[model samples]
Target: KREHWATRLGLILAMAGNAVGLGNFLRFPVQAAENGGGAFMIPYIIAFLLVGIPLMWIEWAMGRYGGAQGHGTTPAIFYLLWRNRFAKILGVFGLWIPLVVAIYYVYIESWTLGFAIKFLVGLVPEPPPTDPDSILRPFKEFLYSYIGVPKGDEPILKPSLFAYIVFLITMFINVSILIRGISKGIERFAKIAMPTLFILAVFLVIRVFLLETPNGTAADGLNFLWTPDFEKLKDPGVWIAAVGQIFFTLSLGFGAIITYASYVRKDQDIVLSGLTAATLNEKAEVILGGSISIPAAVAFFGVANAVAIAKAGAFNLGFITLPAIFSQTAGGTFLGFLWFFLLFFAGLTSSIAIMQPMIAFLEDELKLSRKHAVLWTAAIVFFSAHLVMFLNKSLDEMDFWAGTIGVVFFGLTELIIFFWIFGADKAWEEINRGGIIKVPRIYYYVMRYITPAFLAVLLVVWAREYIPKIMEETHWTVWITRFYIIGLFLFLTFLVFLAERRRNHESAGTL
Candidate 1:
């Protein structure tokens, strides 16, 4: 039997849970703080409204249509958008990118799980009585000793065997829950877990506000969080980072929502659901997460430390700086546990989302039973994740290629396929189906021209950064790197187009 959603609420929660993860609670605060102080919200909201919302609706409608026709995202879109065989290859990339990302993401999530366990076990120590530099040095050293840091003028730390073990255990737990499916497992866990995260987060925010600093003012921290620092907005990097944050925070490229919506009943309103999920996610990330983390960080560490903390490396904010902030505050231990527990739930919810697409692809395309597909995919992901851990020695390079380049490339391809290959008029019709909110005629115009242009500009900008290496004759390494990315894009696009063409020819003969 093809399993339908347990409930409409369950489906919405599952999709939202998938979209809102550690990125919302942990990464969002750090990125917002770093990019614009309070000013970051400007570009972030712009991207959300302009790009995030539309793309989400397109994915959901396409997925639903695909499910109704008994296909997954690629095949479904391929059939509707164009009947080219080459376009079907694009579907393979849809599955491949998320699967590749999951391989590494699970490894990182495992680290969070490990830290959460340590916090629960009361292994973390009290804050030292030194200056910020002194506290940071030992912490950095600990990070270096445990997790090997990147080599640079200042080396970043890397994870040790203990860290790897913790990571693996967390991955195993996530996989186990996913295999149990939604009704038996994911929904029940998310319904409880998400609310718990919200409550804990609110409590922590209150605790920070009530604490008496040496200056005897809670308002100072609040000022740091809310006051716009216009100087931060001067950098173009800030806008770019903001855009990326908006994209990442919403989990737009992951295909998790598409897979989740596939199980939704025929009459479920996709546009409202997608809009609700995206809006709720942005609200939690910008308003709730920022309000809590920023003020809390500033109150504990003061303005200078808050700024320094924002400038800290990407993943470090959640794992390192936030933990350190809580450790120094009153009721530090309890706060630390609460904070990480929130992170644990956030990571778990997102992990379930990540696994869904892979599971769906295997079941729908390979014709495997759901249980068998889940187990096999989980096993492969477990081993593949270890490869990411092994490559952790080259964190900067890995992050640049996989996190930045690969994500942008994949995102651009999705936009092009939907807006160009799939006629904008047709897409809008599918999106407006059963829509409570009627889409304006302008949306078609945006889909046809504005969205593609924006995506194209970003893609070109990204490629410019890598083009120098591609042109170097003596660099076999650069050539290989170029080959993988370029080859993958061309191959996938060609496959999709070929599939679309063959299907079109068959339909013509039938007519």
Candidate 2:
């Protein structure tokens, strides 16, 4: 029998936690600052409505229905949804993407924990009172040292032993929560972490709002973030970036959403639940996330300089730039501690969610007990994670194939299985069945026609652009990462075949 969430509130909070990750805070603001500031919001909101919301509802619907059939993972769910052997194989993407994403994700998650400890103990040194560019150097050096970026001939990814230890500790904590099963473990922790996350975020927002710098004021920062450059709206790259952020912001296609919804009762009001979770994520992202990072950045570094820092990417913003900014502020030491710990909570919550699909697959399909399942999951990730740890450029390659490209393809597959393979009329009935708010009829068409078309076009465009670029990538680490991912995909497929054999034998009344 499948476990059900103990409380409705717990379920909602857990789902919200699943959606809210490091991306909401670190990634979103950087993306906004890079993509024409306020102009980016236009496409971002449109993508949320057209693509994100519809996909959210369908995943919730499919998951609850699948759970009622005693299946929590996508392989069995797709098999039941489409009754075809090929459908089950396509479902492998659902399992594979999450596993591969989590392999590298937990390592990044450890960085948050490591930095939090460093800030708490004052290991991160104070920056010199100098120009904006000069002040950033100390923090940049600390980040590279902590993360173990190669200086000259040092082997890549050979991070400090401290980094490795923290990673193991983070991995241990994840397995601990998961071993307790859903309600008692994941749900209970969400109750605590999600509340603490918001509380800390609010404090940081207030602090950012009160700050002023010689270069700019907090009001100036807000204006810089909100004032539109309408000319930049026509840029196709900005539109693509905005839509892509929706995927990360909402945790769509991560398989975690579908897996989390699988623990809900069949008659649960998933519409209200799903909507509430998405609303919470947006509040955290737009209000709390946008309020803190770039605004604080602009206050210290002016618009032109802040834009340059943001373009360097989320790692630069979160670890390097933000720390430098925070180190120069009032009560800099304490605030730095709060900032990294805030990210730690975000990462810890998400890391567990991403790992759940694998745990569920082992328990539900392979019939492993919770303890054994957690052990096996931990072992697999620990072994596979070494690739990203020691290999040069492995993290970037893995993130592209598994987290970005694989997610889009898997989400499109889910849309097809639900809307086309399962029949649009049936899928519509299912989505609205336990929903408090009946999804509009227009969305029925949106999910069926518009969303899939959007993804298809996106895939075509990405293939045309990225395929040749990926082909030209010739680093040894890059090739190894690709082969490693392929090995994982095939291994998971073999497990699916084993599960199918077991099911057939059971059906024939054999032991």
Write one digit per residue (lDDT tens) for candidate 2, span 406-458.
Answer: 88888889999999989999999999997888988789889989999988988
Question: lDDT (CA) for every model shown?
Answer: 0.67, 0.87
Candidates in order, TM-scores: namely: 0.85, 0.97
The local distance difference test score of model 2 is 0.87
Give the runs in model 1 whose Cα sits over 4 Å from its true position: 150-158, 211-235, 393-402, 465-511
Candidate 1 on 169-264: residue-level lDDT in tens?
A: 776787777778767678777787778867876786677667555643446755655667666666556666676776677776656666776766
Q: How well does candidate 2 score on lDDT at residue 203?
A: 97
* Collision count of model 2: 0
Candidate 2 ranges beyond 4 A from true positions: 153-155, 473-476
- Single out the weakest 10-residue window by summed lDDT for candidate 1: 391-400
